[PDB]
Design a protein around this nucleic acid. Sequence first.
RNA 1: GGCGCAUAAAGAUGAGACGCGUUUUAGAGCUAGAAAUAGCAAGUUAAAAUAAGGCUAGUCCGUUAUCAACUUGAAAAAGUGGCACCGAGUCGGUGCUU
DNA 2: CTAATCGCCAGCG
DNA 3: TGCGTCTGGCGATTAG
DNA 4: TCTCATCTTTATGCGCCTACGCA
Length: 1146
Amino acid sequence: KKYSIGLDIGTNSVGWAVITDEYKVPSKKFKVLGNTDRHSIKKNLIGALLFDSGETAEATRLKRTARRRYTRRKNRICYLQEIFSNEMAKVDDSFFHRLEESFLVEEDKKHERHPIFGNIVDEVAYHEKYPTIYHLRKKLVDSTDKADLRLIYLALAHMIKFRGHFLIEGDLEITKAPLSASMIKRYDEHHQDLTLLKALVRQQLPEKYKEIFFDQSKNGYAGYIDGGASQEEFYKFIKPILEKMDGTEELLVKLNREDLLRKQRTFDNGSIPHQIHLGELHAILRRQEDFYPFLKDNREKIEKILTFRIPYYVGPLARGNSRFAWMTRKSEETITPWNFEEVVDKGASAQSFIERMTNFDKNLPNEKVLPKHSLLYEYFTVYNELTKVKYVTEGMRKPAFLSGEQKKAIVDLLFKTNRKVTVKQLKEDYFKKIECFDSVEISGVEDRFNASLGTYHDLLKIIKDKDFLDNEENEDILEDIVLTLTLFEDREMIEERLKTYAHLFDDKVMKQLKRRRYTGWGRLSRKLINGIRDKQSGKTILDFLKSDGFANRNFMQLIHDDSLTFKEDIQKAQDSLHEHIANLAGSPAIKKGILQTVKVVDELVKVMGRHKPENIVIEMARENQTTQKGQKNSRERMKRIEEGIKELGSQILKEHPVENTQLQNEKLYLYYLQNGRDMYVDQELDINRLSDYDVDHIVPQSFLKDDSIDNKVLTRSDKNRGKSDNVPSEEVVKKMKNYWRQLLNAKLITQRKFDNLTKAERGGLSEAGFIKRQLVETRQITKHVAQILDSRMNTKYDENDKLIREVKVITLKSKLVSDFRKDFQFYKVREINNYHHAHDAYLNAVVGTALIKKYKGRDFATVRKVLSMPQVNIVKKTEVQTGGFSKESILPKRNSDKLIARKKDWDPKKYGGFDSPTVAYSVLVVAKVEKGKSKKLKSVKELLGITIMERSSFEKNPIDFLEAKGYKEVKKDLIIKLPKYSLFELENGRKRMLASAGELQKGNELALPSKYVNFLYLASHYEKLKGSPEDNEQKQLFVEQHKHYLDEIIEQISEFSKRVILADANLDKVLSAYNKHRDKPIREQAENIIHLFTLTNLGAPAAFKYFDTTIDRKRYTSTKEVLDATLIHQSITGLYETRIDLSQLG
RNA sequence: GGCGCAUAAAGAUGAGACGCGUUUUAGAGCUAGAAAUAGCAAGUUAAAAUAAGGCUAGUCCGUUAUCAACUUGAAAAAGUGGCACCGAGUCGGUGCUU
DNA sequence: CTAATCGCCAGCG
DNA sequence: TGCGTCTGGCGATTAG
DNA sequence: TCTCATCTTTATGCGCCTACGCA
C-alpha cells in the first residue's frame, strides 16, 4: 500500500490530492464526533483549502510612526508651557487651564467660555484687530511696544507647533517677516476678489446668487468655505459661470494663475523650510527681550525647542522595554532636548544602527560580513576572476593557465593603473612587452573585466602615494579605515573616530579624506579568507588564490576539496516549528501559506496510517527564456537613455554627463528619462536641487498596488499634491498630449504607461486583478515548501552518506501540465466553482508520477471519471478578525445610539464620534431579559457581536460584562464562541457561513458535468485557436450542433437556485433577460453565461451584468435561523468533523 | 539543486520629519415681523483630539504574524478517529471486525 | 406596528 | 560509465 | 510627499560545486 501526494500552492488556495499507483483516489469512512445521529461519513481524499490573503506590515508601520509625532508635538508644547508657567500665573492664573478645555461644551467647562481673555469685549476687540494669526506675527515682528504675554505665547506656540521641513541644511526690505506679509497679501487679494465677484453676480446674474453664495451641498463658494469642496472642484465649478458673464478678465487671469480666492493654510505649504519660522522667532525674541527679563534669560532654550530633531540612527528613546529600539545611554535620566548629547552615546548607537541589519557569513555563522568596497574583498574578487583565464599562443599545443609571477605582474601593471580594463587592452598593452604574443586566443572571459580595484584608485588619487598601499604592514590599518567610511555617514563623528590616523598623513589630505563615502556590504567574512589555514601548507585562502601550483583552483574548488581541511572546518563550524517559521525572512503572506501547506501535508501523513509517502509533486513558477530576449531585458539603462537622447533633440548631455553607476537614484533616472522637464506643466526642470520635486504614481496607490517604472512620474511639488486620488484630468491631457506622444516615439515610455497617462479620457476607473506581487509570492512559496519538505520528511542520516531517500520531492513546470491539459481535452474554466484547485493538484500528481515511472495511453477513463466527481472537500479557514477598531472618519453629532465615543468623558450625543465597528467574533448566549413595560424574565437566545475594542474586557470576565450589557441568568457552560466563516448546515443540504453578526454568506458548491464545461470552453475562444488552424472546423460544427446544451445549462442553474440560494427576484429577472437574447452569436452567449455563474459562487454575494442589465446583489441580512441549524467544526482538511446541534440548547 | 562577480527590473523590513483633512467650541449677525419665515450683511483664523487606552511610567507600547473541537498542561507542548469492494448530484450501499 | 430592501460609503500627498 | 536541472454598516424607506 | 539604511528574488554573461536518475 504505497501512495503519492500532489500539491498545488497559490496565494489564496492550497490544493491537495492523494493518489495510488494506478492514479486512483481512495475513499474512506471517517468517524464524526458530537451529539447528532449520524456517526460516519464517507469522503474522498482530494480537496482544497482557502483562506484570506496575508498582508504586509507597511500600514502598521506608517501608523506606528504617526503615533510618535503626536506625543512629541504635545511634549514640545508642554516644554514651552513649563517655561512660561510662572510669569503666566503672575498675570492670569487660568490661561493654560482655559486653553486645555476649549473643546468642551458650554456647560462642561469650569471657567469662562472665551479662551484668551475670558470676557467678551476684549475677545471681540482682539478679533477685530487681528483677523488671523499672521497679522499678529507681523505686528510682533515689526512693532516695538511691550506686548501682552498671552499674545507672545500664542505666536510662539503657533510657530513651534507647525514648524516646516528640514531638507536644506545650514542657514538661508521694508519688513523682516516675508511669510506673514505674503499671507496678508493673500488675505487682502481674497477680500477684494470676493467683494468684486459679489457685486458682479448681483448685477449680471441675480437668479444664480443662492446656488453660489448660500448652498452648502454644491461646489460654490459656500461649499468651498463650509462644505467639503477642494480648490480644484471649486475652480472647475466656477470657471464656466464667470466665463459666461462679462467683466471678469482679471479674475480669469488669476484663475489661470491659481491665485483666486485662496486660503492661508492649504496643501502646498509643505515647501516652507523651518529657517523662516526660526528667523521670525529670533526676531520677536530679540524685540521683546528688553521688557521681560526671563525671555532674555533663556532665549536659547526656546530656540533649541524649535530646531531639535532626533537623528535617524539613534531611534526611539526607550529604556529597555521596546521592541524596535537600539539606543544606549551613558547615564539614567530624563532626555530633554537640552541635555540630549550629554546623555545618549551617539557613536555606539550609530554603530548598532547599522550592525543590527547586516547578514552573517553563510559559511561561518558567527562572523560579521566584510564591507563591499574593502581592499581584501576587491583583491579576492579580482584574483578569483584572474585564476581561471586560459591563453593559447603560437607554441601552445594544449592550453594552460597563467603563472604566479605572471598573475603578480598583471595585477601590478594594468589593474593598478586603470579603472576598468578590456580584453583588447589586455591582449595589446601587456603582450607588447612580452615576446610570446603572436596568435593570442583567450578563453573563459568576455570583452571587458567585471572586477576592478576602484577603491585603490580613489585611495591613490587622495593620498598620492603607492608605498603605503603596496606594503603589507599597513594592511590591517587600511581595513579599519574602510570600516569607518562604511559605518558613520555623518561628518562630525568621523573626525573623532579617525583622529588616531591623522598622525601619519597630512592635514589637507585629512580634510579631503573625510568627504569620502562608501556603502554596501559584501557576502563573505575576513575570517574565512584570511583567518583559517590548511594543515601543512601554511597558506590562507588568498595565498592559494595568488598561486596554487598547477591546478589554479578557484574558491569553490578550494572549499570543496576533500584533500584539504576546509570542508571539515566548515562542517565543524556549521528548535520549535513555529519558532523556525518565525525565524524565516520574507513577506508574511508566504509565511502563512507555507505554514498552512506544511500543516496539511503533516495531517495527510497522519490520516494515511502513519506511513510516509513515496513522491511529493509540487509545481513551481520559474522559466527558461532565450538569450536574445533575456539579454534584451538585461541591457543597462545607459543604453536606453543614450538611444532616446540620440533619437530626439538633445542638449542636456552637453554639460551634464552621466555614467552607468551614478544613475541609480530614482530622482535622476526619471530626470533623464523625461528629458529634463516637468511632465504635468511645460517648464524647465532643475538638477541643482533634484530632490524638492516629487515622484507620483499615475494611478494612485488607493486603487492599485503597483509602484513600478511604468507608473512613476517625476513632477513638481504643487502638481502632485494638487490631485489626490485620481488620474490627472483632461486639462493636463489637452496640454501635454503632444509632448507625451513625442516622448512615446523614442520608446522611453511604454504603451501601458501612456494608457495609464490618459485614463481620464475614459473615466476615473474603467474596470485590477493580475498583479506581479503574486508572481513573486508563488515562486518564493514553492522554493520554501520544497526546501522545508525535504528537510522535514527525510530524517534518517546515513553513516558514510548524508541521508536515505525515503521520499522524493519532484518539482514541475506549468508548461508541461498545460500541455497535458491542452492535448487530451481536459479543459478548465476558472469561473464556475472552486474544484479546479483540487483538479490541477491531481493533474500535477499524475503527470509527475507517470513521467518518473513510464518514460500511459490505455487508461484515461479513470482520469475522466475522477475529473467529474461531485464530492470535493472545500474548506474556508475560520479566522478571528483583528485590525482597526472602526472606520477612521469622524461623523458629526446626531441622536442615534450607534456612535462610539472618541474619549472617555466625551458623550457622543453632543460631540460626535466614530461609527461602524468591526466584529472580532460572536458568541451564542441564552438568558432572560426584562421585556420592557412587562419587565418580567422572558427567555431569549440570540447572537452577540464582540467588537475588537471589547475583546479584552470580555475575556477578563464574561459574566459581569454581558450582565451589564442587559442579560441575566446565563449559562456559562452553554456559551459557544464563533469566529468568522463558521459553518452551519440548514435543511435540505443548504450551507451558510457566518459573515459577521447578522449577515451570512453562500456556502454550497455547483457540481457541473464535464460535457457542459467542455462545450462551454469550446464555445468561448471560438475565433481564436492560439496557433495554425487544422481539424478545428469539426470543433466549430460540434459547438454549432450543441446549442441545446446551453438551454439545459440554464436548467442546471435554476433548480440549484431553488435549493440553496433563495434569491428568486434576481433569478427570474435574469431568466427573462436570457429569454430576451435568444438570437445572438454563440460566443457572446457563452461570454455572458460565464458572467451568470457568479450568482452561485462560494462566499460573499456580488453584483454583475448580463448583457446591459445589471443585476444587483441579494445580501443575507438575517441570523434568526442558524439558531436552529447544525454547527460544523471542521479540521484543516475537512476530514475530521464535529457536529453540534443547536436545537437542543435550552 | 546550490555559490562568487557584473548588468537590469520587481519588491520587502526599520528609523526620522513635513503639509492637509475630520470633529466640538470661540469668533456678540442686523431689519421687518405673534409667526411658519422673508430681505440684508458676513465668510480666509485659532484651541484640543487624531485608534478606547495600558503599566513596565518610557519624549515607551497599542491595527503585522500565530488561532477547529476535545483530554492534559500555568504556558510551552503532547494526544485523540479500522480495512477492502461495488458505484456516484455534494457521498451511498455491501463484507470483514473492533 | 418591526422586519426586509435600496442606495451610499469607506484618511491622504 | 558520462550528462542535464472589495464587502459590511447604516439611514431612509417600504411591506407585512 | 521628503530623507536615511539594510535585505531577497528573478533573468542574461563568466567561473565553479554536487545529487542523482537517465542515455
